[PDB]
Each structure stands twice: as structure tokens, then as C-alpha cells.
Design a binder for these strands. Sequence first.
RNA 1: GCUUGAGUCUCGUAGAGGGGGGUAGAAUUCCAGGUGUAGCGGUGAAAUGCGUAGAGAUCUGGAGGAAUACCGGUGGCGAAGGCGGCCCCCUGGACGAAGACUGACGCUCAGGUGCGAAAGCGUGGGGAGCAAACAGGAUUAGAUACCCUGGUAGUCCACGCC
RNA 2: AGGACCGAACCGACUAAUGUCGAAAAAUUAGCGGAUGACUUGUGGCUGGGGGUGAAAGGCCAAUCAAACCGGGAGAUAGCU
RNA 3: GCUCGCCGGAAGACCAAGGGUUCCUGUCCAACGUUAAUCGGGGCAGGGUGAGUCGACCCCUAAGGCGAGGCCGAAAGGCGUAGUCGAUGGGAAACAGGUUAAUAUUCCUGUACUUGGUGUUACUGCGAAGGGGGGACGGAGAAGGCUAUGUUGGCCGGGCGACGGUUGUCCCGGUUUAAGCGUGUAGGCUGGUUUUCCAGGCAAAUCCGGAAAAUCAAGGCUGAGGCGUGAUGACGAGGCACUACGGUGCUGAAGCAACAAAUGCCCUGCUUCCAGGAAAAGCCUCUAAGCAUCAGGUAACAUCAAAUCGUACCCCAAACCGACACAGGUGGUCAGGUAGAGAAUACCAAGGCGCUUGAGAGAACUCGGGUGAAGGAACUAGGCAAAAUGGUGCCGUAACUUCGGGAGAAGGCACGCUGAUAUGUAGGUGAGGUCCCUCGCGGAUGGAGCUGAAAUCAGUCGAAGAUACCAGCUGGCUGCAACUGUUUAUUAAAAACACAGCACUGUGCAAACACGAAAGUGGACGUAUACGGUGUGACGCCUGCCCGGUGCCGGAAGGUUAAU
RNA 4: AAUUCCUUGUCGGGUAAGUUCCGACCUGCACGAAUGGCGUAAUGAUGGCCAGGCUGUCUCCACCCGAGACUCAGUGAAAU
RNA 5: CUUUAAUGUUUGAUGUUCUAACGUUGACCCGUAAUCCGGGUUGCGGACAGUGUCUGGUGGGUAGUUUGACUGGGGCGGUC
RNA 6: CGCGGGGUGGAGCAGCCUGGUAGCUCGUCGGGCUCAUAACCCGAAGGUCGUCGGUUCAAAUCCGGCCCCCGCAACCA
Lengths: 271, 46
Amino acid sequence: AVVKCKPTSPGRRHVVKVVNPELHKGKPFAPLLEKNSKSGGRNNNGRITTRHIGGGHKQAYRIVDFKRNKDGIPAVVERLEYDPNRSANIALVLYKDGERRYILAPKGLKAGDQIQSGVDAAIKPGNTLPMRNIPVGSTVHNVEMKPGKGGQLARSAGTYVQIVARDGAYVTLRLRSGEMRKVEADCRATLGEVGNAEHMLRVLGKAGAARWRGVRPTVRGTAMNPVDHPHGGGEGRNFGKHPVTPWGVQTKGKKTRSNKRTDKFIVRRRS
Amino acid sequence: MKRTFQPSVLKRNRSHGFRARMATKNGRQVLARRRAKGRARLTVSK
RNA sequence: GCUUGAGUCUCGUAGAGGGGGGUAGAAUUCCAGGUGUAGCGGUGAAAUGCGUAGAGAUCUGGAGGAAUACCGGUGGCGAAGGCGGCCCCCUGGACGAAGACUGACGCUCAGGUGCGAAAGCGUGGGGAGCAAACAGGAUUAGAUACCCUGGUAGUCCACGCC
RNA sequence: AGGACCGAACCGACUAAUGUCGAAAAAUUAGCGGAUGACUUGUGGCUGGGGGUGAAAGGCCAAUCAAACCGGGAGAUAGCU
RNA sequence: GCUCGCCGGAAGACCAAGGGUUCCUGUCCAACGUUAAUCGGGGCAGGGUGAGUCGACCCCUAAGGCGAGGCCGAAAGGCGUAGUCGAUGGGAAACAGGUUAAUAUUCCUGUACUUGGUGUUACUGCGAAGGGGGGACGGAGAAGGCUAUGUUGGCCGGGCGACGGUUGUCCCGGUUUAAGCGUGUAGGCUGGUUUUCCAGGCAAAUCCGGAAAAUCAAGGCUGAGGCGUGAUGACGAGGCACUACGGUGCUGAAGCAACAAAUGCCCUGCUUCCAGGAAAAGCCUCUAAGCAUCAGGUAACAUCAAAUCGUACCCCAAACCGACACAGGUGGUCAGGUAGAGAAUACCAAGGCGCUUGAGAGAACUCGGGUGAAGGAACUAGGCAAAAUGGUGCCGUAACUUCGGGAGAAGGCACGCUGAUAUGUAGGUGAGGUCCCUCGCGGAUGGAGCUGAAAUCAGUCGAAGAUACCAGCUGGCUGCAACUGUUUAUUAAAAACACAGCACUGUGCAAACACGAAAGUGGACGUAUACGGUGUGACGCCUGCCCGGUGCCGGAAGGUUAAU
RNA sequence: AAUUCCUUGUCGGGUAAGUUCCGACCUGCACGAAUGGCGUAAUGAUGGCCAGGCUGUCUCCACCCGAGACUCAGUGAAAU
RNA sequence: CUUUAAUGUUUGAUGUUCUAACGUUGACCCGUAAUCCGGGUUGCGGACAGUGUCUGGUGGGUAGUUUGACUGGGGCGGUC
RNA sequence: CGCGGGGUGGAGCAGCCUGGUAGCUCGUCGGGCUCAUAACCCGAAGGUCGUCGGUUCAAAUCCGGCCCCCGCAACCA
């Protein structure tokens, strides 16, 4: 449930941990693994391409499915696992034929229920079926872009997408941010709200709580030296300048929508 | 204190060795330079 | 021991009683498009505001949140607060009918516990209209009031507190 | 359970004295802080000069940093000594 | 050689890194050693490093490097696939004793083990760069069973003692044994076996995964240590024996029990929590293209091979790094006795050293300390420095508070030795005997021996019993910052930075942003409860008015407006 | 006030004596609500003040024990 | 000459549709046991996007430099 | 020492900038309305445009002296 620990040390006095009892308290499936080592935000040229990345725990990757290319095959869920490479819960669901595959654990699903994947399925939480065969106006997630990519929409905790229109070859959605956009109607989209919905209530508490999760301490711009940040300087906290990013562009209001090869599909920007 | 030299034969040969300078073009003329001056110790070697 | 106290059981009655989950229609707002044009809005009057970048008006489509016109009645239910579009699920009390049964098992009740409009507060969402604070325009001797144009919190929902 | 408490190894370096051509081109002595953690450490790699790294001091990048070192422009130039 | 003193979780003993003969022996003293020097890490000469089991090489991967083609880029060159390299990782196998001036898990003796080749005999289907299982794993915590090791006693050998006692509850020394094999325990894990079918595992499949039946309830896997064996062997105190007087030859008693107990092992366990905890090969196994009088595989036996390299010595230091024979720095393992909670500390065992200038004098002055009458911060920029407090158990403990604290608050009492309760208690451990048995490393039962807190009372000793080393100074008011933490290595450790939390804003994924002429990557194999920038910096109560100036967003009608 | 120039501002408390300090008056040279305002338990090798305790810090030093200084013998620099 | 109407003709700015350029960090197959890549089918976009050349704007993210002299020292003021 | 702006009925502001015409609110005198005051409604008077001189048809205006006032001046070792 949603609990707070009793204060022992100033740091434990603000710890709200998300304890889910139904989580699998054993070690996970073997064949669906692979080492997912990090590189601290450094690339080929090894420079820090993205800040605040480095350190953290050493963990492995579970090839969780989104594609759901298995068709017309019933599958019964078995274990609920909180994956270290997501923010939402995953569920070990065994496809009856003889293979286990990891899928995102939705809200209305017990690790012991039978889900079915295919257009022949009805409207029940956890089933993968096209939006054109879905009574538009429902609540889904993991919506694809390409008819065979997997689903890159609403893939986090307590997330979902409202379906607006279904005019022919296009299905207009209302994304989580409110971005009204059309997508190819023949694509796959799974039903149900994504579980692990109390993730946003998770307060970290101490400094280390964000440290072992990789995020490095952010050094402010007014803390930097005039040579380092475009801000810097100021003898006694003198800011007097318009906030910018460490490379020039004036932040706090400067839209960067420069695509045009895909600018056309949106109906409403986040406004 | 901590003096600036912690010897390690492999580390000394991994980035300063013979083949390391025989690895690319720039390092190649390094030996063209040292061969021109004619050092008995052509490179830090065995 | 007895029964006129009280309580229970059999069959039915009316109801905005409560909680949870769906759903409908009208209207308001916004957005997009077509027609079309100098006013629109407002008040005691006027002005701020909106408008020739083309509003308001009008037709069509879509998305929304909230309250449920008429029925509605000094009508009904509940301990009180309070509660009304419809449908389903679970559920509380009251009342009537002809009998049986237990046999004073009762009345109130400091302390204590629970419930408890609105406003307010914390966490996470939602956010049409309305509208503290606030701003502008007027009234005025002054108007940080009454009036008008906008408008944040809030108002709504789930879990706690007061 | 604890970025929990006291305190050795380990790591760090707050005070004082000694030292300053020292034992030492920042150490020793007597007291100190942390010490299951954002901890420390060995080995092996990757990021590089107007760039790298930075819990941000313009510190650190081989006793050298408000722009390393080595060689070449180059016997730069100097109204100065 | 006999005393003295020092370290003794090290200044001891072994390795890796790194050095490179500094190791051992003989000889020599000009040069090196901060002094002398027949001495030595110095000169000259000779000698020494013996491996199937150690490490590496080798097999296979990680970060990452390189990279046939390929994409891209003035050129150079950059990134990257297949592959191929790369440990700090995983993967076969040996220990004891003796010996040398110097090396030995390497030589010798004794006793074992591992992976392949060839051949023989008897059976039998084998077979991949392909599939599956295994390899294969986190932090912390608690408990049980043992071991390393130590103490006491028994036993054996020797002594009975240079100043009083000491044949006795006396003193001292020894009381050691591996790898492997067999047994398979304490403990942990898991329900086995049989039949049938299958859109599953890029193809196949008897292997795995799954779905139904059957039968029975155990089978299996794993596993420190003990016990036999290894071993009527070795070693072994002390004698016996010859000295170049350095040491060698020979012989050889006891060799067990009990208690305590590791951070070592079982444990690459078990419980629990969250931040969710390598890869590949070896190994076992199933089949594809196929090959079957074959070739190969399984088992037993005989025999052969195990190549190349390192192996000296130092290894918390006069041999590494610091110009030096430099009060500094350098990772890992082993690690006893008494006291002690402890790897703190003090004194010692093993073992190694007294630091490569000494001998006198005992002034001023300088440094490290001891003690101090009366006073006790009057000192000084300032209680800087010294002094003092300092342990365990128990008693008791405020303002305030986020109800966890504050707190070990403050402040106090008893602490030694001896006897008794009790010829040493509670507790712990536990043989013999007895009974039973699905007979073994068994279960109850039984209680000797051994070991051993603490509490009460009585008595006594000194001024003082946590008597040494060791080991908090405390309380009150208040500014700032939340706190832990980090930073100017080498004059500033803080109020600076970070911090969890909050807010604004950018971002629909070939995402923003960033490195990069480009490709390609990070972001992220994440996707709005997400990622990036900025600002502030817990929690509590709140965050008002201003859109004039600048920046930004939206709207574009009109004015103006480049190239064309 | 880490801010207050004038200033050691004014009043009260602490001391025999208080340019510092604590609590208040507002006359804010020149505080101010995320370059966040005001409180704040806990924490601190942090700044300031005070008290208890304790002592050579001081009145005022006195003695003693070691290492140098002094002498002798060997070796033998240095800045300038 | 102005206002204007049908047509021919000449180019341009918008709206929609289409597929062949092009894009494709969509699916699948083969080269090939290879997430690079190339080609082949097919789907979704679509003369957009993107790139070269010219060009206006913005632009301390970046680079090269200037920022006077006299002066009873300089700065400030003043002057030339 | 200097630089910038202003000086307008009893109070304070317009007009100046870009030359021919001097305005607004309060106030003063007064009335009405109320029983009274203020307020309110309404009309009129009230400005040498600080001062002198110059220039052009006309000077508040364009300019030059004198006086008054507000901010900054009384540093860097």
C-alpha cells in the first residue's frame, strides 16, 4: 500500500515507499534476460552528451514485449514483477502454446487471469486489438505508430490514451500530454489503464534515493563561473540575465518543434 | 605523499609501447623522427 | 411465574435513505470549417472589453466538466446534517396484516465512541459555467463597496483531517 | 531497517606546536571528523588543449593551469632595461 | 657468547604490482655508506631459479580497442557488422616429510589425482557456427552445527633444585599427522515415476515448456566436519655418538580425553528488504544437413604424452615510487598467550631488530614532558594551549519537539581481595549405563567429568579498588545553513556547493538537447506518473502589486522589406 | 539584522565596569515575499556571548627529567 | 482615358487528388549463423521533408580588436 | 568648481517641443436648496506668463545675463 516509515534519521522522516505485496518475491525468468550496462551518458566520442547520468546500480534487462505479434492465442498471467528498466509493473504471462513473454501489467489484471491476443478478442483489460475494432472513446495504451513496431504511446505507470475519432484510415488520439494526433487505424493498441499507478506518490526521501537510480547532482547555473555557464558570475548573487541553457538558447519559453516530416499529423499542440 | 609514477609494464606498453606507436599514421612518424635522430632505445621496449 | 412493556419470525407497501458502477438529453464554453457584415456586449447612462486580422448572429461536426427544466406538492425518507434524470448491484430503517413465540430481556445516561451543511487544509487528478482575492472601467467629496467587463483559489472526484 | 549512535583498520585533513637552506618541493607529534555508506580501494579501460572533467574552486588534467607540455613558425616584437 | 631494552594486528612470515642478481659463497677497502670499517644491498670472480597438479601461455567472454565488406568524410581519417582481441571474472587435476651455503605444493621418498592420443575386447547409433538446462551471481541480518587455534588434565621423559620452603594439589618440555578413497551426517532444496497429445523453442527434436490422466508417497540432488583408511609409515622431547669445534651419523617414549571457540567452512545457504542484483565457454543433453560390413559414442584394461615461460631475493622497504641507504605513500592472505566487549591498548610467545656518528659537560636559550604553595581567565583578538571529564550495571533525567528524539541530558551509588550461600551457583556442554529400532554418523533417557557469569552476606587491606595503558568536559541564549555528505591536492572545509522536495518551461519519438564537417551514438533499447534546461533548496504558515523597459509566446491586416 | 551610514543610536538584563551579546522601540542612509520572507525539532572539527568545572594561560614563574645547544675526535655544506 | 465583359494567350499564388522522384531509425525474405548495410516484395507518407547555392533577420554560443592625451600620482571634474 | 530639468491666478498643474487664438480641478465673492454646516449645482472676476534687453508683422513662445530649487561631490593605498 501507500505507507510512510517512522523517522529514525533525518532522511527517513520523509520516506514514502510504494510497497506492493503481490510482487514476485523470487528471482525472475532466465531466457528473457540480457546485460543492460550503462555508460554514464557518454557516447562513441565518450564525452558527456547528456548530463546527470552516471553511477547507479548494476542491473539487467528483461526483453518485455510490446509488439504482441502473437495472434489468436490465449495466455494466462503468472507473476507480477516491478522491473528496474521501467516505471510500470510487468507481468509474466505464459502463452498457452509453450512460451512465456513479458508484457506490461495493467490495472485490471491479476497474475492468474487469462488474456487473449488478437482481433477476435472482446474488450477486456490486457487484450491487444486494433482501434478500428474498438468502440472509440475507450481507454487504452501502448499504441503503435507503425503497423508492426510495438507501441510507443502511454507506456508508463498510471498512464493511458483517450481515443477521440476513427475517420477511415486514421484514428485520432488524445495523448497523455493532450496532443491530438492521428495514427494509422490498422495498428495495435492494448486495453486497460497501466498499473503501478501509485508511482507518482513515491517520494524518495534521502539524497541517495535518487543517486543509486543514476541521477547525478545538478549544479546550478548561478553556481557556475562566467566561463562555464552563460550565466555564472555575480558577486553576491547577481543574476540580472534572462535564463538560458548551457549552450545559448533562451529557455523558459522557446518551442523546439522542428520536424516537418511529421508536423502534419497533429491536430492540437499542447495548448 | 603520492609521487606521480606507479609503474605497470603492460599499462606502459598498452599506450606507450612499440605497437601502440606502430598503430597509426601519426605515431609512425614519431619513429620516423626517433630513427632520424637514431636512438638506440627506439621506443620504450623490452 | 404472568402479560397489556420491549424484541423476533412468516407475507406484502411507499420512498431524493446510503455507497459503488454505467448511461441520457437540453444548455453554456472552446475549437475547426461554410454563409455573412458593422456593430456586439452592457447599464440608470456610459465606459473597460470584443470587432473590418473580420466579432456577434446562424448552420454542421467534435471534445468537455458540472447541475439535473417539467413531474415537484407547508409531498417523501432519515437520528440530525442532509438527500431528487434514468438503470443495475450490495444494503439500513420505518409501517401495515392476521397469529405464534421469548417472558421485563427495559428508559435515560456523566466519562467515552461514531456521524456530522458550508467554508478551510494536505496528496493526486479534473477544470465548463460560476466566482473570494485581484485589475480595469464607472458612481462618488473619498468607493481598496453596491453596478459592468475579465478573472486565480475554490466549487466537482477518490483517500484522510477539521 | 537505518546516507542510525560510540569507536579501531581504512579514508579525510579542524586546531596547536615543531619544521621552513626541513626527515619531507605541505610531513611529523598530541588531540580530532566520517567510519553499512552519496563509503573506500586494487587491477583494466574511455573522455583531451579553446577541449576534457567538475556535489562548481575558474579547481584538476604527471611537483606546471583565467587555457598543459614538446617541437616548429621564430633570431616573433619591445618607443623599455 | 651472556645480559639489557624495542615491535609484537608488527619494525613478524608469505605473494601480486614493480624492480632486475640487490639472493649465496670467497676475497678486497681507493671510490659508495653522511664516522672508523678485516662489515655490507660497494668492486672483482664463481655458483644458484629443476613443475602434467602454482601462476601465465591456453579456452571463453566483460568495459573497451581494432575492425574484411559497408555508410560517411577535402586527404589523413571517423563510426561500425560479421569476426577477432582484451581480466580485476569463470573453466581439469597434489599434499605431507626430509634435504641445500642459496631453490623446492617443482628435487627425493611415500601416498594420490586430472585431461587427451593410440591400441584391444564387449556392446551401442552417432552427428553442428543450431535449441535447452547448467555456469549464474544483490545488500544487510540472525541462528545452528563444526574447524583453525588455545587452555586444563591424564600419560611419557627429565629435575627435585647455587638465600628460607619444594617427592608434592610441585616445576618444565612434548603430546603433531595432509591430499585422496570409502561412509554421506548436521543442514538446505524439491513431490517423484509412467502414458498420450501440442498453432511453442528462426527447421527438427525422445531435451525443454505446456495441457490432461495414472500410481505411490518418497525418491533424488547437494553437503562443512567427524569416523576408518592414508599410517605396525613419517615426524617426534631427550639420549647415544664424532668435531674441520660450523654441524653430521644413529636411535627413539607418549602421541589421547575434555572444555572454550573464530570475521574461517557448511553459506555460489535461510529470512527479509529494496535501489531489483555480468557474459560466454568448459560440462550434460536433443536433433539438422547427413554418414551406418563403417566412421564415432559408452565402459573396463594396457601404454604414452602433458610442450613454452616465470620460479633467485626484496615485496608497508637502504632493493617499488619519492634526485638520497629520505621520519612520507604502496593492494591481498595468515595472525598465539594473559587482561580486556574488541584486530583498541599494555606486557610477552614465534620471529626479527637497537634505527651507520660517538665519548664528556650538565650554562643561557630552544623543543618534548613531569610537579607545584595562595588565587583560578585577572591572560588574550579569543579559554589558543594545557588541565580536567573519561568504564560497566543500576537509579534518575528538563525547555522544546516533526512525538523518532532531546539523552550517555544534567546529576549520583556500588566496584579490589577472601570465605560462605555452593568441598565453585544459575546456565552451557555432555561419556558410561538402560530401553527401543524402519541398525545407522540413530532416537529418548541418564547423569560422571569439564567449564563457568552474576547476586547477597560477612571479614580484611590501603590515602586512593573503572587504582596502569585505555577512556565524552557540561549546561544556557542566539545567527546562519536543513540534516549525512562535497570543495579551493600544496595558506580559506564555511553561512559556499550538493541535497530530497517544489515550480516554470521545452519534448509525440528519426523527441527535445548534445558530441560529431558527415555517418553514427548518448538520451533510451526510456517514451509524458517519461527525459532535458533553469530557479530555489527539508518540514510548518505563505509567496502580495506592476506587462511601462528588455526577453519570450501567439496573431497576422496594413507600412516597409533580400535574393529572384 | 551576515543589511543601520550617522552610532558605542534608545531602554531593559547580564558585570563593580559590557564599542561585543540577548530581548525589545522603529528614525529601514540602503530588508522583503523561489536572486524566496519569517519560524524551526534534530544535526554542526561553524560565528558570537555567558556560567559551572578545571587547570601555570596570567599575578610571577620556580625546580627537575630527556633531545640539541657547550667541549673533544672523524666527516663536512649553505644562502651571500 | 476610366469603369468593365466574353475569349484566346502568358506566367504566378492557393485547395484537393494521384504515383513514378525522394524519404522510410515499419513488416518480411535473401545475401547471412550478422540488431550495420545493400538489393527485392509490400505498406505508410509525398513532390512535402531533406540537402546544395544565393539571401534577409537573429546571434558574446564563438573569434579578432578598440576602448585618447594633458594632469603639481592616478581616478573624478575640466580642457583640447 | 560641473552636468540635467523646472520657475505659469490663493494651491498645483496645461499650453512651450512644431511662433499670430491662454485651459482644467480645488479655492474666493455670492445665491439657492436644508432648520444649520459641509457637500452639491451654476455664473463672474482673478495670469506683469520671475525680470531686462534683443530679433520678426506679433514674444508665454527663439536667445543671453541675475536669482531660487532638487540629485550626485567630502576617493584608490
